[PDB]
Every structure is written in structure tokens, then in C-alpha cells.
Amino acid sequence: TYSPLPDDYNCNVELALTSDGRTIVCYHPSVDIPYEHTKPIPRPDHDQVLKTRLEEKVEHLEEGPMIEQLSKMFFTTKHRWYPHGRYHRCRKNLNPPKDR
């Protein structure tokens, strides 16, 4: 019944020692999410004559209002949304090294 940690969230840790006591064995099988702990995916989201053609909803926004909308939908501040000068735009590496 004893367990160093609750074996519910990550895996089942089973500490053990060898006969000579020179090696510690840890058997940790992965636990799977039960079927009863999930929710179904919400898949769902006339007398018409004229086809509903694609209508552009691109409303013109100034520098001020546009940044305030961006700063609220991403929970950031106004400062990061302003552009930068040429000196900073040319120092950035356009071909940075890539790992993995």
C-alpha cells in the first residue's frame, strides 16, 4: 500500500534493489487516460434566392485602435506591436543556424 508518490498522474514508479545492492532498478510503465475522464468533441458549430457571396470584412483601423485590439487578444502590451527602424531591421539574421 505504501507509495513514495501518488501513482495517478504520470506513471507507476516501482523502486527495487538488486540482491547485491549495487544497482537500483526502477520500473515505470506509462499510464493511459481513462475513457471516463474525457469529453466528446463538439463537432457541430432557407428561402434564399441570391448566393451568399464572400464579402470582405477587412475594416480599416488606425495605428492606435489596431494595437489595442492586438494587445488584448494576446494579453501583451502596446510596445511590442510598434515597428522598428532600419538599423534594427538589418542587424537581424535572416539565415540563423538550426538545431535538431
Binding site: 545492492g21 549495487r22 544497482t23 537500483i24 532498478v25 526502477c26 520500473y27 515505470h28 510503465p29 506509462s30
Partner: peptide, 16 residues
């Protein structure tokens, strides 16, 4: 490994 883990005290045997 994915399911099992072995520890040395402080080193594992060379035959392991």
C-alpha cells in the same frame, strides 16, 4: 529505457 530504469551506486558494473 521507455519503461525501465537502472541506477548505479555510484557506477554500474562493466558486465551490465
Amino acid at each position: 529505457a521507455d519503461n525501465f530504469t537502472l541506477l548505479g551506486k555510484p557506477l554500474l558494473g562493466k558486465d551490465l
